[PDB]
Amino acid sequence: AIHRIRITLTSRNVKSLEKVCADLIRGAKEKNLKVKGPVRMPTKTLRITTRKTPCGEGSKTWDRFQMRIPKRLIDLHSPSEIVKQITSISIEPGVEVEVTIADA
Amino acid sequence: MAVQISKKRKFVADGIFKAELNEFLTRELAEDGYSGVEVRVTPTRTEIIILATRTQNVLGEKGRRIRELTAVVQKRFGFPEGSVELYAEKVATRGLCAIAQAESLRYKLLGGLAVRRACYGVLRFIMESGAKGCEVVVSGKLRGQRAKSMKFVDGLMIHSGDPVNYYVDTAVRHVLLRQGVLGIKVKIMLPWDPTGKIGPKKPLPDHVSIVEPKDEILPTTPISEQK
Amino acid sequence: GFYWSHPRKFGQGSRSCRVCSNRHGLIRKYGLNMCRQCFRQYAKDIGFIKLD
Amino acid sequence: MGRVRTKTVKKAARVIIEKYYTRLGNDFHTNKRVCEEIAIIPSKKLRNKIAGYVTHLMKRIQRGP
Amino acid sequence: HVAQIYAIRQSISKALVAYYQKYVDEASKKEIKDILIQYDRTLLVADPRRCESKKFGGPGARARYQKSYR
Amino acid sequence: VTVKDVNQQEFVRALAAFLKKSGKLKVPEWVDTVKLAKHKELAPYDENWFYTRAASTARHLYLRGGAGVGSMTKIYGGRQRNGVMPSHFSRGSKSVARRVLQALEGLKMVEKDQDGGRKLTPQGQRDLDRIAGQVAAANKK
Amino acid sequence: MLMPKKNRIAIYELLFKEGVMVAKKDVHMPKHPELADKNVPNLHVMKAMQSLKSRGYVKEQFAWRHFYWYLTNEGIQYLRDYLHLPPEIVPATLRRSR
RNA sequence: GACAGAUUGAUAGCUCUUUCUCGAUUCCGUGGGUGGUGGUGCAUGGCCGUUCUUAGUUGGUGGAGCGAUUUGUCUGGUUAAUUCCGAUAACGAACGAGACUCUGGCAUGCUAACUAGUUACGCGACCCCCGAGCGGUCGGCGUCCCCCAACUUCUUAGAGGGACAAGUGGCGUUCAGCCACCCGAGAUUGAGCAAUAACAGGUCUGUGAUGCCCUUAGAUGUCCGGGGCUGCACGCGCGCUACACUGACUGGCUCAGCGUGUGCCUACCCUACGCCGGCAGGCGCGGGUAACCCGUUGAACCCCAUUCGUGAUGGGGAUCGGGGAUUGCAAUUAUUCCCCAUGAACGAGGAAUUCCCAGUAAGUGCGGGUCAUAAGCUUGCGUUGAUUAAGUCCCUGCCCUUUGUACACACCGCC
């Protein structure tokens, strides 16, 4: 075995991240062990501000190009089964999943 | 390798890789009606579902073309031997995708045809397919030294709001001809408002559906019952 | 094969648009290196969606 | 000034009442989520905004038809 | 600097209000809440306000970079 | 009556006095010809900053558990006319905040902490706020 | 049948070894992933391949400054007869499928 | 494809002898390209600008006109808004507005969170009189933390709720609504999205989008070196800093937010803490795919502590003298910075004219963008935070209606 696993869920789509995030809670609590539920980091807003205009002219209008990236993370304690079950299931959309070994 | 590229600078990169594909893919599987990839990253592997139409051409000689494109994507964005499998699939109801039809109109003109009869042939189709509405614009010089702009329209179309963003299927494609350059713009309206399966939101937020009294029979004298 | 030599290492000598090799109004930030137009083309595809 | 009602509301409102006179009353927050039951109002603003006339037409009805 | 003060004013009037309410009484809570809200200065009321954003084509929210004009 | 309980600006007034009336600290030579920070226009009038600034610096460390030279420079700031230019923020002089720290170190008001940065040592912790009692109890006013 | 012999004879036999040869449009690389025994960047590669297409023994795409060099069935002859290579040859697209 | 010199700028065999190798490349014609930040934005695509965040636009069926057309699409009240109701030859519909999205604020209501905070504990402590206190006890920063406290009071971000002219009193055709007040965020916190239809608006120099045209080796192909784009009797355009004492410089205290950061597509950061130096800086060393490190982001105004005395003075702070650092292979054409040194006009601006109503103008730094070097540029962000309109069409310009019109390149017309 039982080691200090962190699962770091980073994705853009809040809804398609929190269907996965819920399935790891409900996937672990099925075969119960521990957790400390989903952590909510500040959402990072990737904000670009370019001119609307190609070339010069016209009254100066710009767009406000944004991309969000919310990070959840979920602590757990398990063997090399429950990790390799819970991570490989509940994948699919534009969702990145990290797996820390223990502590550091 | 031990870079760990940033959740800021990484999703940007995979957005970019996404874009870089969807262009060469568009620009090479054009005559075959590329609708779109949906990039499918996995363990040990990077699936990449090429959602196009006429799959007899993406395969080619016994499945050569698919194997070229796999090799290409191996040699470009850095995907080792057996770490990338393309997966060509046919588009469901190709009338309702925009760039499919917009390309079908780059090549219907390119082939040699009037604007008029062609774009109707498109516009006819996309409605008949099953659209809430649609429009096509063929800007550019059109049998005259001067530039015209032509716009043949049919059915319903919302032209503002967030709603637009997940409902219309916009698609611009040029067309390079023996003269010069026209623009296609296909802009279809999706009637997944009726039945996506669960059509996203479904309501255009304006639209409310009041389910009707259904029963509400009987005032009557009192009575009782037992069970 | 010799001579074609300077700092092509800093200065806009070095950096150019990844899409079209034009060398102005360049979105350096965030490891893009697109020209500012080549945003609005390759933008939705990237992920930057116009919200407010 | 800010708020006069739109015909998506004025029409839906009037049509709920035509069909559920008995279900509604002269409160807001009751008939407020009656509308959640008997209709598919997507947005909370509208859902909520609709119980607007649902009341303003009961206050009319008791006084007159 | 200044904000931090109606912040701490509001806090030791609110806190003191929740004091006499939760365990102590209510009459004194109400005699307090009266004594305060007969002149607020947003004592128990959060000032609902917060700053506007800047919009392009102006130094602040509203004002605009001077119009050239022939 | 800690450093906080004493009205903090008439703290360093008396703490400047302390380190003067001790007659030891280690006043040096860049002193009479010091700018104080490229920041400033002009060399300071009370000819005796660092008795009053080592006062500040040392009480400052009391309030904050750890502080580097880079920190001390930061804190004694200001605006800076580059002239017709707009004003910007320039760090204070390192040399002086440093030698203030090193000099406080001589009397052993302070020490180098673990994990980098100076903090004040128990001995100094005293001399500092001993006089806090003396500043409150100088008189109520 | 041209240019730096050592480099260009190797570029042919690279292209015959492979199904597809990608590149980049950049004269200033002194290298190119796989092969590049020595230098042979874009130029020596391009100069070769932009020959091959125009005569007809290769076909292009471009796609965000790169050159998408795809080997033509006629070229199979041109380059194997250039390289005296066996009359079976098997370039690269041997392609065990299913 | 050519290691010493004539040269040339160049160790450019680019060329004037010598020749020593790769060795089927080479060279010379012809056609033809291939580019070109060449040409043409009245040859075009896209994208943008705008008429124009202005209320407008359209059709099915009716009804009117032989028919272009017309009503529906409107006297009036209303409304931010042909938005609504109603009068109603129209009835019921569609796009724009609205609804929506993002956002911004009430949520001791929920789900939680060592990549937040933590909170307050429990306070178990170190703990020095840090301070109070004879001592018990207490006020308090720091830490000793950790944690198998406990929790979400603020932090964060998920689900939620709510606010909806909702109640009451006026006013109102007593409809549509408007006004006041109650509870409370009172119906409006701010953008994005934005129709029909336009316009030689702009863009070929954002586009491997490109029509045609030019040009095409002596090349307008690509560059090296330099130069220019910076030049200066004058003219205008957006900025900043001042004109000072509600202020100037001299102590000190002390309050963030949005970001941003390395290790990035080809050679490159963010920076904590040691010494050295005045300072630029320098030289030591440390954390940092980051809510951890920078970083309780320790700011300016601001706030507080002394000078000064209304002197073009200490404001101001230009123009030059001289040093010293840094970036850069190189700064001459002061690169950027520091250190000295000189030390200007301006004492509130002549004719005009833009900006806007609430957390608004203004000041005020600070990020971002631009960046090797670097901003007086913008775009965001708080922070300090006013005066005043809350209405009208008086000027300018916009909407409808009626009307006149010899205008329809539409009055910048026609004559």
Q: How far apart are CA B21 and CA B76, in angstroms?
A: 10
Q: For every residue of chain C, which 3-state class applies, written as one string?
A: CCCCCCCCCCHHHHCCCCCCCCCCCEECHHHCCEEHHHHHHCHHHHCCEECC
Contact (CB<8Å) G64/B76: no
Contacts of B11 in chain A (CB under 8 A): 10, 12, 46, 67, 69, 96
User: By the CB < 8 Å criterion, does A96 face chain B?
Assistant: yes
Give the other-Cβ count within 10 Å of F125's Cβ.
16
Q: How deeply is B7 buried, as exposed, middle or buried, from its count of CB atoms within 10 A (0-12, 13-18, 19+)?
A: buried
Chains A and D touch (3+ CB pairs under 8 A): no
Q: List the resolution, Å.
A: 3.8
Q: How far apart are CA E19 and CA F47, in angstroms?
A: 53
Contact (CB<8Å) C8/G28: yes
D39: part of which helix (H) or strand (E)?
strand D39-40
Whether residue E20 contacts residue E32, with contact meaning beta carbons closer than 8 Å, is answered with: yes
Chains G and E touch (3+ CB pairs under 8 A): no
DSSP class per residue in E6-52: HHHHHHHHHHHHHHIIIII-SHHHHHHHHHHHTS-SSSSS-----PP
- Give the distance, in angstroms, between residue F91 CA and nucleotide H374 C1': 19
Other chains touching A, judged by 3 or more CB pairs under 8 Å:
B, C, E
CA distances from A81 to A31, A77, A85, G15 (A): 11, 11, 6, 46
Question: In the numeric block, which tokens belong to residue B184?
Answer: 């296609």
For H200, nearest residue by CA–C1' is B146
Domains of chain G: 1-98 (1.10.10.10)
Contact (CB<8Å) D19/B205: no
Give the other-Cβ count within 10 Å of B127's Cβ.
17
Please report, in angstroms and rounded to a whole number, the separation of the first and last CA atoms in chain F.
15
For H96, nearest residue by CA–C1' is B159
Interface of B with A in 7-46 (CB under 8 A): 7-8, 10-12, 14-15, 42-43
User: Which residues neighbour F99 within 8 Å (Cβ) at sequence distance 6 or greater?
Assistant: F28, F50
Contacts of G28 in chain C (CB under 8 A): 4, 8
F83: part of which helix (H) or strand (E)?
none
- Give the distance, in angstroms, between residue A71 CA and nucleotide H259 C1': 18
3-state secondary structure at position B144: coil
What nucleotide is nearest B133 when CA is compared to C1'? H94
User: Which residues neighbour B13 within 8 Å (Cβ) at sequence distance 6 or greater?
Assistant: B5, C31
Phi and psi at residue B203, in whole multiples of 5°?
A: -45, 125
CA distance C20 to chain G (A): 6
Closest CA to G3 of G37, G34, G44: G44
Give the other-Cβ count within 10 Å of F90's Cβ.
16
Protein-covered nucleotides of chain H (CB closer than 7 Å) are: 2, 22-26, 34, 37, 41, 43-50, 78-81, 83-85, 94-108, 111-116, 127-133, 139-144, 156-159, 161-167, 175-179, 185-197, 200-212, 222-225, 237-242, 249-255, 258-268, 271-281, 289-291, 295-296, 298-307, 314-318, 328-330, 337-340, 344, 353-372, 376, 378-385
Q: How far apart are CA A52 and CA A60, in angstroms?
A: 8
- Cα E23 to the chain's mean position, in Å? 27
Nearest to C30 among B9, B19, B22 (CB): B9
Closest CA to B28 of B56, B61, B57: B57
Which residue of chain C has the CA closest to G64? C19
- Give the distance, in angstroms, between residue F101 CA and nucleotide H305 C1': 23
| Size (chain B), residues | 227
User: Which residues neighbour A6 within 8 Å (Cβ) at sequence distance 6 or greater?
Assistant: A73, A74, A75, A76, A98, A99, A100
- Give the distance, in angstroms, between residue F51 CA and nucleotide H169 C1': 72
Contacts of B208 in chain D (CB under 8 A): 8, 12, 39-42, 46, 50
Phi and psi at residue B49, in whole multiples of 5°?
A: -80, 105
DSSP state for residue A62 in the 8-state scheme: B
Task: Please give the method by which this entry was determined.
Answer: cryo-EM
Q: How far apart are CA F99 and CA F92, in angstroms?
A: 13
CA distances from B84 to C17, D6, D52, G35 (A): 27, 54, 57, 22
3-state secondary structure at position G73: coil
